[PDB]
Amino acid sequence: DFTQMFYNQNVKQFWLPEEIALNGDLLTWKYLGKNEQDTYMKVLAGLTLLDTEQGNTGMPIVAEHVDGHQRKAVLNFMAMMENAVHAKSYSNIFMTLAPTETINEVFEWVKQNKYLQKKAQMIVGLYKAIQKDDEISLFKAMVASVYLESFLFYSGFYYPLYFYGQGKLMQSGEIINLILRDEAIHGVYVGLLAQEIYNKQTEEKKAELREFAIDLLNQLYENELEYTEDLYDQVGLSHDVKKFIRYNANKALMNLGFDPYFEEEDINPIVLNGLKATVEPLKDDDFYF
Amino acid sequence: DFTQMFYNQNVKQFWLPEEIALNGDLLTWKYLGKNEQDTYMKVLAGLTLLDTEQGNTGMPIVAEHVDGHQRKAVLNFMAMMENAVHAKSYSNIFMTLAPTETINEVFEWVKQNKYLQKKAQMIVGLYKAIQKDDEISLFKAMVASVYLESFLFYSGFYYPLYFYGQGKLMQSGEIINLILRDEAIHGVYVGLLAQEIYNKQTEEKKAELREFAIDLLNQLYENELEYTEDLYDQVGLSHDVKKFIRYNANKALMNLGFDPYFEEEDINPIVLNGLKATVEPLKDDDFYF
Amino acid sequence: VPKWIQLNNEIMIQKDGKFQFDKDKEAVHSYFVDYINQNTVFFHNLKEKLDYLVENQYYEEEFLSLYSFEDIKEVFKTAYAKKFRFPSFMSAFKFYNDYALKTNDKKKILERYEDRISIVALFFANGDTEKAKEYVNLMINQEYQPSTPTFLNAGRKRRGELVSCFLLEVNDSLNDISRAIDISMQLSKLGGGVSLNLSKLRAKGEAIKDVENATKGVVGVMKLLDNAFRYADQMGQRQGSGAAYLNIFHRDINDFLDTKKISADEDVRVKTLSIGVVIPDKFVELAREDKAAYVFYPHTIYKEYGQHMDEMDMNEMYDKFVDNPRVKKEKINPRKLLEKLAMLRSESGYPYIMFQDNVNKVHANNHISKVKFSNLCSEVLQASQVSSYTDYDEEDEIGLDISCNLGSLNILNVMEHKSIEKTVKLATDSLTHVSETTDIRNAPAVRRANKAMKSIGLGAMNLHGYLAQNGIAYESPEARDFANTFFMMVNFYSIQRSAEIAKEKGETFDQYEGSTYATGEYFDKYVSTDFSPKYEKIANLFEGMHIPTTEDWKKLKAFVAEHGMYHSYRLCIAPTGSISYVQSSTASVMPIMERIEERTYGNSKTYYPMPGLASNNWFFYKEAYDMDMFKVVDMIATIQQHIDQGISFTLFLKDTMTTRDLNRIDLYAHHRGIKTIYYARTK
Amino acid sequence: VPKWIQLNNEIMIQKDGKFQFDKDKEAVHSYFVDYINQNTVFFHNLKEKLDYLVENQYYEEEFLSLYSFEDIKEVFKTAYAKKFRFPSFMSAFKFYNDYALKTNDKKKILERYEDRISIVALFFANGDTEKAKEYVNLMINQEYQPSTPTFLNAGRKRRGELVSCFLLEVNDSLNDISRAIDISMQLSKLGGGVSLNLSKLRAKGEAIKDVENATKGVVGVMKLLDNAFRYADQMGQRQGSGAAYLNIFHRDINDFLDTKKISADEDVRVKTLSIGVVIPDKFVELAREDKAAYVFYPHTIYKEYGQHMDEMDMNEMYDKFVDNPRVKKEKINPRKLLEKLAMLRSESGYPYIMFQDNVNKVHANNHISKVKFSNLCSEVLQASQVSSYTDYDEEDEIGLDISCNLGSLNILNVMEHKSIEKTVKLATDSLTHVSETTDIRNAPAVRRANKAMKSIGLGAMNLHGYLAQNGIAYESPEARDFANTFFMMVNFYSIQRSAEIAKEKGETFDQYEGSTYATGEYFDKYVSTDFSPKYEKIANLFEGMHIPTTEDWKKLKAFVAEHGMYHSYRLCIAPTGSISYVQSSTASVMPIMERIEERTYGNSKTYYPMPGLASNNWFFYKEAYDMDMFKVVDMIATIQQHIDQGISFTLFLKDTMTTRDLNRIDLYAHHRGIKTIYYARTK
């Protein structure tokens, strides 16, 4: 009911890194404090590392196990965007803002970081556990994928959106907004594929899959809180970032056809500023009674 | 030495069939004989099948086994083109020119056609035989992919080109030329990757790999002859198409770094004719004059 | 989760294969012994409570000053002597969440059900202690329910207006359009739903002073009204709701309908303004004969004849419009337009359908004006005269803009108490008081029509509840017989009360002398046809009550001829959406949508069974979607023959049926005399 | 392709490395030999022409009846005796496509240039044949050009109003908002551009009748106004144009600005509503010192102080607002807000910038009111008093809504005729006549302010054309010297004519006694500083004309003290969009955007070189984008020191410069005394 519509929306959102000139960001970058520059670098590396997993494994593995030519094509298109567009875009932002040696060090740090690794390996673990012709294991991986696309990225997206909403780092913020817009549709699409599997299950199996999804969400959420404090306490933003994580967790759940887990909260306004019945002809004698 | 330039070439060649309006072919299509329309539909259906498997299976599987994020990005992009652009374009052509029943019948015809099933069996079999960290199985699949890109498509491409060259079906022909332009660069790129693996081998191993490549080519060739006769005898063109596929077989061999295998022949000259603003912060000195 | 929430959810947990309906009662107890009694604010006596509510700007002191405190204490004691108990959790929840008065910070409950009823009764009585006690007994017995505006806002300082619906006539001028936008914003600020007749506005491509193809049509005015209703949204609490009505013979009728198509562009789509279509009998005749019809440009007709297209009878002037070369018209297929209406109603439930000839063949005030459109709920059908809002520094010609006060009889409680007459008369008095104390200072036509017409709307609720709790199928002929008798009694006693008020005040409504009430024509079918029950079961249901006969109707006709009628319009059956919960009643005279409804509040879910639902009456509580819409049309026509205004008739459709079935239902409704059709809700 | 179009496109074809400018002249001949004369309706005599135009409702009878036919014939003969010839094809094309009177079928030409000029002169003179001949000589010499409304509509029965700039004050009420929407619709119907001040409106999240978080802010009002302007679009001829002005200290200022962002949603963005921001000196001081600023809730300030936030001086009120706990405010970064303004102007050219203190430190009528906002073109700067539009059947308190009268001097034609005094006085008389003959019956405050203030706007154009044809660079100090002298003489003769009219009629403008004209303060800089040219070239340019000295200014000051001044405002420099083509002049006092402009009409291309452009003056006709914006600001400030109202000042930016450069230009404009900044056009 939905693949051709998503095909259309995906291909019409096509874009390339070269379209946004990045050099003018140096005019606001130079005015940020060390903690702001440090947080930005670390967040950016976090997003880059997670998105690489999605391009190399997450999207291609789902495309491999999903049946249907049109679904495989949409999934291929999404994998292409991860590897050919998003990955080059993140690299471009880095090369503009930091010298080569600084980039290498930030990636070394984030590669060793406990909270980034915990979530990266949890997601990758579920992708590696998919078994041929087993729709339960595929569903679990789809849940992991939706959580990455619609939830885990957002502790990171917060900061570029925060600057973007203030008039700072506008070129890289525009790029991030385009990336985020792609991840949103990726999350919704994979969510619909997961619901299709979920709806084929018994009531007991459904309850079991719901417990899986909520348990996974809880593990990731508790690690996100730690990840958040680790990066954002030094710039005083953690309270507001936490509200943004929960709001996006609820969107991820709704993508999977589940109820929201967290109470509704308002979001930081700066970040917000950054963000047929069958026709049957009348046959006459229908006017007479 | 080459991936970056292929990356740039592939992304700059990006297109969608919807860019080409097809209603202009309606009259030249209406005017073709029943035999001509039948061959044309079947030819494009055979192409659709090849691109379906190249997009679903061939390109993604090669991407999985080839090392390097940039090489993977090129291969992922090529995969997307196969199933999200090329395979779909044929349906755009079918939906314009043919009624639903004729479309349904031709897709049923691909399923039961023995030559088309044999060529798919052979090519996809080699893709699925790739073993992780086994460069020889990978080479064999890359040879198969080059033969699909640079040889097997051409029994199909002949007919749209033959019409384009006579000023007939020129909108459909424009789509086909764009597809052909893509496959030419896909065949070269995969050919270069295959040569990388071949060049690592002993002379004895190389001799075996040439045997594999030539045996496979001959087996595919013999099947393609029967396929060509089956499609083209009713339009009187089988001998001409055979010359064309031999011509392109030599190009496939050359893409693999091998000498031409068939003698040169004159190809139908008709077919040859068928070929935001930057933002700076305000300084305290900008408020004084 | 709260204890009462768990007890209410325990209903669906079946025990021995049966629903645990009694658990619902337990929930209410919990809801009172854990939330309401703890969150209520208690005072030492009633004096301190009244003083606190008066000085803290919760209550108006004027209506309370008409009684000595002893009388107010007696009224409150009468309210509390009944020991009223909410039989379902949802009734109490809905009252204490939507209608009970809370503090400024909404942390505590200041008004109980008895307190609210006492305040409303004291406001109604206007200084009469005995009348206040009568109103208290009427409302605590739940025989009569004032509308949501009246029940919620009576006697409150921070109140809005007590009138629920307003109907505006928009003349074909920029001044009139701007005044209509202003009045719509003012009335939405007051909280009322506003309906606007756009049939007088000239269509798209008409001339504004000799420059042709200049008008934006009714779609531009629709966009303006939609933005006005979006802006005036009850201070952001309830979304601003507006209705636009267009005659089906207007040239813009397609574009009008295109405002509700799900594929409409943003420059055409209108989303907060409901749409209604007024269909004369001429359109149905043209569609029946499959003859191509003509939609007309209103301004050309006004230029040629001096009157608006909707100001005269299309059944007699359509051929003159078509044969007149000076009248501009466009060819349409009436059957295709009907199919478009059915498709639109299937997709979105719009437009409202108003059968103009069905309304005006029994309309008692055609001399004042014909009914050209309905309200936002498509049940108010009254005469309206368009206003001529002129330029600044020029006097405006103020017309009549419809406005009536709503109030519903609880059929189950009224018939259980055998008090049709007393309840009808007291409800008529309360609605008359609400009309008299209504004064709107920014809608001049509404104010003038309220002062002159004195129109009220006395509805009814719990028809299906009463029928199912008495073992009568809603589609059965016995149910239609009961509706006929009950609503004939309601009409008889409403006319009697209106005539008695006219006698006691010495005044009738404006232009009553030309009405069918004055000439005696209105009583024709009542002085020749007997509406006593034809079934023994219904007659037993009406035992202990004097069913009016033809002789009583003749006496009432003579009484009206001698004294007149105070109210131009008396009976209109509103949907009664949320106040039906508090009364433990089914919504309006419509059949129930579902036996048990699952509603999500906060993060919790609650189940409301239909009032009186049990094992023995499970199948008598047949869901509306499972019912034959033709028999529901028969019921609504049977009720409508005794209702002077319309009835909010919602169609309940299944997904399997086609637009042809919807068109057949609409045409059967038109054939049976249905005045208006409210909604096409698809399951 | 028509012959004249080929002759016009032959300009770009270079012969001997030079543009064939003279070919344009040939094109004009063709445009008259092939098209204009063929499609021009000719009559046997002027009597027959006038009878046909009056009878067929083309002209008005009233203004022609004031003259005998001999006087009208003499005026027409005076117009035709000049033998005026359009020097460029685009001049004649623009006149005969936009201003020449055509038949109802729009295929024949009823009015030539001389006919239109004679009719406008006869309308201006109001019965004086000699005055009509003076006006004819003024307009046929092309020294003075009435604005597009006046020039197009004067003497025509089928016409809009002669005023098209309207400024409305909107009070903080639903009645006032609805009245503002109505007045905007009525004035757009008349063909005028409407500017509304939204600073008095309370921000989003304010209280309505003591209920919190209820107000939608100024953005909902902007949505309503945008819908009103889309609806009222000159009977479907031009797109309805409106402007909204908000003070930068209003809390909605961000959301206001967010209405112009491309990323804004459909419920946020307004497309046909221009926006302007009023920036007091306090905001610039806060941004300069990098101190965090506060945006205030207007209703809290009104409740605390009894006056609106925009009605008091923010320079002395800002600290009291910040220190007042009962005034609600939000923290903002003024430098971030300035960067947002620059970014928005780069993206879309919005908002207009009004430097409140720059306007009000030289405002002569601060006693009446301080200038709180500007017009749609950001050049009208007048005192306005808000109106209190109450409920129905209640008397409104009518204030002052600005509506000034436009008319432009052609600096080249005026100075080559050595007739600054005569042209200025005759233009002032014509503007006074048009202001007196304007009567708007749907805008009460506009009509009251037109009757009381008698404000007119006398502009100038062809400044860059005159400077380039005289070998003077627009950025040169000699150009600024010429502008200083010329506009000081314009101000002198405008004040002299206003005082003479006041003496003749015996009346001044309302509240003149409190103005700086009455106290003599206005003339201070004129009685102490000599504005004679400091360069010999400019003095030789002014040869043959008496340049007012300090003694002449003292005499004028004494004359104004004795007799008063008839006009509250006299001079405002409008953009002069299409009339600059007909007059063969550069637009306003702005520098030219292109030396030769390429336009597409129908499916044909046309080429308009700037007037007088040749090989010798090609370098002096420097394009605006290539110019230093600081020197353009200097010239505009030099002119503004002699203009009582503002100047439509468009910034011309290259795509290379960033928002820092735009902010620097804005801050230098604020420093140099620029009152308004119109547009940021990026090349």
Ligand SMILES: Nc1ncnc2c1ncn2[C@@H]1O[C@H](COP(=O)(O)OP(=O)(O)OP(=O)(O)O)[C@@H](O)[C@H]1O
């Ligand atoms: N269903 C209900 N509807 C309305 N009020 C209720 C309801 N249940 C409890 N209450 C309120 O909570 C109080 C709790 O008392 P409850 O009904 O348990 O009996 P009680 O203490 O014996 O006294 P009584 O029934 O005479 O009021 C009631 O007095 C009443 O005020």
Ligand SMILES: Nc1ncnc2c1ncn2[C@@H]1O[C@H](COP(=O)(O)OP(=O)(O)OP(=O)(O)O)[C@@H](O)[C@H]1O
């Ligand atoms: N450049 C122009 N601007 C305006 N009108 C023009 C122009 N060129 C020609 N016309 C119109 O065409 C007529 C013919 O002018 P032409 O150049 O042929 O010679 P003429 O001596 O001016 O003619 P006439 O006897 O009409 O006065 C003019 O009188 C005028 O009405």
Ligand SMILES: Cc1cn([C@H]2C[C@H](O)[C@@H](COP(=O)(O)OP(=O)(O)OP(=O)(O)O)O2)c(=O)[nH]c1=O
């Ligand atoms: C002014 C205006 C009117 N209209 C339409 C809507 C009104 O119903 C209709 C009447 O406008 P009117 O206000 O009546 O215009 P008018 O009185 O000057 O013209 P006439 O003498 O012909 O009545 O014109 C528009 O559609 N757009 C507009 O901008």
Ligand SMILES: [Mg+2]
């Ligand atoms: Mg009119």
Ligand SMILES: [Mg+2]
């Ligand atoms: Mg107010």
Ligand SMILES: [Mn+2]
């Ligand atoms: Mn990505």
Ligand SMILES: [Mn+2]
């Ligand atoms: Mn993604």
Ligand SMILES: [Mn+2]
């Ligand atoms: Mn391909």
Ligand SMILES: [Mn+2]
């Ligand atoms: Mn390929």
